[PDB]
Amino acid sequence: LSTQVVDHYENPRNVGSLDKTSKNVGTGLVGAPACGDVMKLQIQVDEKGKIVDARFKTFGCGSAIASSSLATEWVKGKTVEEALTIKNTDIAKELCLPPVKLHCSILAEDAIKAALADYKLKQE
Amino acid sequence: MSVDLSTQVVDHYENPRNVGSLDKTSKNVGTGLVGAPACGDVMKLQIQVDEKGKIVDARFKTFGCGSAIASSSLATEWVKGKTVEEALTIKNTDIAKELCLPPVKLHCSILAEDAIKAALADYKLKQE
Amino acid sequence: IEERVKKIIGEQLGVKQEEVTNNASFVEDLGADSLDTVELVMALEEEFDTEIPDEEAEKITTVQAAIDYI
Amino acid sequence: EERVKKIIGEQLGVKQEEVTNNASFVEDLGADSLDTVELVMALEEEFDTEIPDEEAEKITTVQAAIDYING
Amino acid sequence: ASSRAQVLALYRAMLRESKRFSAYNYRTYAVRRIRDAFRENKNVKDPVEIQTLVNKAKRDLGVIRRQVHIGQLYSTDKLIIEN
Amino acid sequence: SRAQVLALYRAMLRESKRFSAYNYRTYAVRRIRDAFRENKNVKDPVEIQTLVNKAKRDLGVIRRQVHIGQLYSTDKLIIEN
Amino acid sequence: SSLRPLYMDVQATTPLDPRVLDAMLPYLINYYGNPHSRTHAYGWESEAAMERARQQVASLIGADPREIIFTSGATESNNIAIKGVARFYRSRKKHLITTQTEHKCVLDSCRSLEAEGFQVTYLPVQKSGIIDLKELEAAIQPDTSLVSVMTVNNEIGVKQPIAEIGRICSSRKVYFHTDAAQAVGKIPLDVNDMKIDLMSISGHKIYGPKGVGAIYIRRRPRVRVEALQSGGGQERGMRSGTVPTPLVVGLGAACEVAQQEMEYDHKRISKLSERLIQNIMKSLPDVVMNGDPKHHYPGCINLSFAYVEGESLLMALKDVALSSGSACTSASLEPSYVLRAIGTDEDLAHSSIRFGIGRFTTEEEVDYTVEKCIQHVKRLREMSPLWEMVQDGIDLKSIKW
Amino acid sequence: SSLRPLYMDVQATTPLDPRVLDAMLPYLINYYGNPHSRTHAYGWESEAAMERARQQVASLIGADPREIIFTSGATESNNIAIKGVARFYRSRKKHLITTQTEHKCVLDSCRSLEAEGFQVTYLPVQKSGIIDLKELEAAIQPDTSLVSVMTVNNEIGVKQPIAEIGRICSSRKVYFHTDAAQAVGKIPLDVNDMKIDLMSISGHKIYGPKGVGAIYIRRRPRVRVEALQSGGGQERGMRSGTVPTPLVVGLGAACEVAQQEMEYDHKRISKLSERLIQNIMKSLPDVVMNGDPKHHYPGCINLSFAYVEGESLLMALKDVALSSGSACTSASLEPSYVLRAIGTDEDLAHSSIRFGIGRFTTEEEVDYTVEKCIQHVKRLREMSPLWEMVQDGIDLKSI
Ligand SMILES: *P(=O)(O)OCC(C)(C)[C@@H](O)C(=O)NCCC(=O)NCCSC(=O)CCCCCCCCCCC
Ligand SMILES: *Cc1c(COP(=O)(O)O)cnc(C)c1O
Ligand SMILES: *Cc1c(COP(=O)(O)O)cnc(C)c1O
Ligand SMILES: [Zn+2]
Ligand SMILES: [Zn+2]
């Protein structure tokens, strides 16, 4: 169990929720199949396409919680196109996740991309 | 100081009784040397009888476990001054009862009995 | 925070701090039995890091006696 | 009496005559430092004492040992 | 003619010795069980059964002594709730 | 050093001789003797420090096991007479 | 080198009772003789200790000493019962009956027998965790050789109706085995009153030493068992190998002590269990206890905290040694089959943890664990999306992979 | 005079080395966690100690730690090796090879396999107790899967030619298993140098605790073995059940200490053994040593005292704990099959006793045993009818 995972555990950054009704908020609600690890990650995008803040809530193991906290921390102030380059393998590398817990990283990536997809879907 | 080893057996071992040998040539001594089958326990028992059929003394030498030695010594104590016919009444079960021998050591008693009978057969056979 | 043995005694016998008069007796006044008194004197040994020996401890039956000994 | 000499020989395996009072364990009796430790311990067992290390350090001769084993 | 005094010293000893257990679980269990046990048998009147309980308590006193000593020989950290 | 070494030797012998068991006692004493004597002529200071530290660990073990044997002693051997 | 956490995992193992260690040490120090050495005193004293221990176990469970076989643990015991009975009657009987909540050694032994051509019925359990006796009766076949049902569940603590199962098996002339590893020394057990034919016993479940156990094989209406460990014929030929003297001595000491303190332990353990449950429930809603409280051993309390994942809570309680039947934290990500058997919703299956209250547990440990439990369940709920959705009344419709 | 007798029976079991007990107690007191509890600190420390001990054993025998499986004893190990290997390859190979002097666990496992449709060859041994390699080579069949030969015999102490057997078995694609209960920590063992595929180790034979053992299962060429104990899959699925932490800890400590002291122990043990033998032989005639002294471990000395029964001698030496292969000492009266196999005349087979010299045996113990042995052998010979007849000469005497 890596130290980075413990730091993001309860020291989690950006825990919370945003207003799902905002046309400028993308909400990704993804659940995993194998287990019950569920991640909800919401991002808010400015007029210039930059993510101005993000909040999350996850029901899952410590490694999933930390994976999502790190995820929102990383999408800090990046472009909606920039954020697409966040890779689950970069997450697992950042957190030193063992093979048994990679489903957490795959879930975090999935959540990010689902949320960004929601944003684009609201601009139409 | 032991388990299924009775105290009587210990007395007849640590303190063997009537251990020795007589002169087989005296014509008045019957010597029976019989050995056990499964457990190579061998017993040599000599008895000396004066006129009138009474046993005047008895001696033995035994190659075997403690229960066999003690069984033979007890045999010599019992074969003291009894009738040659009296000795015919010595039963292995009386020995096993006297010593509280478990089933694993009964081979001793059955051998001791045999030895007695072997000695008596030679004596009678000594009278042409 | 001085001779606060009263606190200790009160904790052991569960009596209001006001009923711990120096003239109080463990058995006659505070409702303790002989066992409770044993655990009490041991509690004082542990609180003040002492070893009030048996030959002296046998006579500790009053609050003023306990204060006196220490 | 002062038969510690006997002990010394027993410890060093030397003839009772070769335990001269003026003899030194190492210089004369062929002992090493370990033999000396085991020797003082043997005296601790024989005379029921506890000559401390700071006191044992001064025991280098037979006459010194005899002297100490008198008080 | 009461063995009361003999009991009391025992109680004292059995508590004192038990209080030296290094381990939280063994210490607490030993002390509490000693207390509850003496209290539960306080109303016994049969002298023979009382002597029985006393002898058993002595055997348990030797056991507690030896085990507390060993626990000191191989002690470890206190529990989080100890401080 | 040297004096520290000898002090160690004395300590380990004194503690070893308190073993309640004949086998444990005799074995401990004899092995300590043979060990120090076997290493008497070693010159490398690092290996010497290693052996000394090992001797300290074995001294703590000897203390604890001697105490344990005292708490749970039994009859002496027939050969102790 | 920081402070140590509270031990609340007594179902995995229990500490040695210092009395037991005192019972063992003489044979670890001075009495090292082999009990099978018949020709000297070391053997005699070792055998004496072994037989004394045997009588101790028999006294605890109400059997004859000759009916107690020493083993290396409850796992070996269950292997001997299932494989031995199954194989002995193989020529005429090839059907066995057990339950789906049985320990993994029973289940996997039965699995190997299935791979060997046997028929096995794994009885389902009601949502309470207790089997339905009628399905047991109707499931028994004429070629049924063995019925195996554990006494107390190791994960939820439910007590099965052992006595009635014994009556049923007897009336059907079927051997009855019980895995009692979690019951010996905690609840009364009498093989004759319960019509029990074989029983499994674990040493380290009742504050005894690790690496030793026992199996009761009834000798009255004699029970036949094929030995699995070949050798010199120790233990009436049922378990060849050198009887580990110190371990069995410790086992006997543990069983005797358990017979002495069973009632007291049940009183205070029950009090602490009720305290923990009642205090946690009054402060946290949507917490569900797994297992029927009407037939339940209070020392094992399995609780599901809705909307919170188990391992996240365990990580929250870094100061308390606990366990959970959560998919996460399991080698092969796999949810507890016990919880699946009682029909637990997947969320609560992932939201369950097990508290063990034992001979040495203090009220302080219980209160500390309760407080941290409330605090961290609250914190994790403020972090949980399912909580938020329930408080908002969303509709279960997440997206997967 | 309730004094205790000398222990000269190290082959049956040995005392704990105080180092091993000191290694064990913390896990009997404070570190009581289950090593398979992965979710808290108690389990973590138990697992840590267990794996460290594994590295200790492997280090003693020169194996990879992944090749050490913990069991309840050498008996369980031998059962796992023989029955496991035999069962795994049953589909294509049903012949096994062992010897007539192997321990009863190997023999009875082979017996059960015979009841399971396997054919088993029990190789005879020369009068020296050493198997004949030519008969081993010639005995292997195309469907031979496993060869089982113990390293050192527990009744006579003879050392088998392990390395050559390994070469032969390897060259024939046959698994090689050895019951090493009597060799680990007493004579050098290297699994790779000896081409060994499976090996059994018993804790209480090497001053470790009773109730724990190990089985070495090679991973290099890999060996397939069917698990005998069903369960949750602990120990790579080979031996389900909760690993007894204190026991494995003690076993590891015993292996490390044995690796440290093996040479010293062998030197002084051998010297004392020669002392005992030479001193007994010079004072009692017609005493015969069972087993070739040219390839023999000095810790196990089996001697037949002609014209004297074993148990009577054992009772004579009430001050020394010994053993004998005399029928008149077994529940089911049965003479040592080891002695019968090496061709000892049945009579002398009944006259054998076994002296074991161990890490803690003293020279005083040896001299005492020798003196009492001489005294009581003479006394019993003056009581022996076979002695008398031999001095006078004769043959049979009926049955
Ligand atoms: P002095 O007359 O000058 O003596 C010479 C000495 C040794 C003191 C010193 O000058 C010297 O020569 N040093 C060179 C080497 C040395 O000092 N070695 C000291 C360390 S030796 C060592 O490792 C002791 C071995 C301990 C093992 C004992 C184990 C006993 C069994 C344990 C039972 C539980
Ligand atoms: C703990 C447990 C076991 C384990 O048995 P061991 O061999 O002692 O490890 C078996 N069955 C049950 C029900 C258990 O709770
Ligand atoms: C002592 C011995 C055994 C017994 O193994 P356990 O650990 O007692 O189960 C097996 N084989 C040999 C060669 C032995 O000497
Ligand atoms: Zn997870
Ligand atoms: Zn006999």
Numbering used by the authors:
A (entry chain H): 10 to 133
B (entry chain D): 6 to 133
C (entry chain G): 3 to 72
D (entry chain C): 4 to 74
E (entry chain F): 3 to 85
F (entry chain B): 5 to 85
G (entry chain E): 54 to 454
H (entry chain A): 54 to 452
What does the paper say about this structure?
Biogenesis involves the de novo synthesis of a Fe/S cluster on the scaffold protein ISCU, trafficking of the cluster via transient association to various targeting factors, and finally cluster insertion into specific recipient apoproteins. A critical initial step in Fe/S cluster synthesis is the supply of sulfur by the cysteine desulfurase NFS1. Here, we report crystal and solution structures of human NFS1 in association with ISD11-ACP, ISCU, FDX2, and FXN, together forming the ‘core ISC complex’. We show that eukaryote-specific ISD11 binds to NFS1 distal from the desulfurase active site and does not directly participate in catalysis.
The Zn site shows ~ 71% (chain D) and ~57% (chain H) occupancy in the two independent ISCU molecules. Interestingly, both the electron-donating [2Fe–2S] cluster of CtFdx2 and the iron-binding helix α1 of CtYfh1 were located close to the Fe/S cluster biosynthetic center delineated by the Zn ion present in the (NIAU-Zn)2 complex.
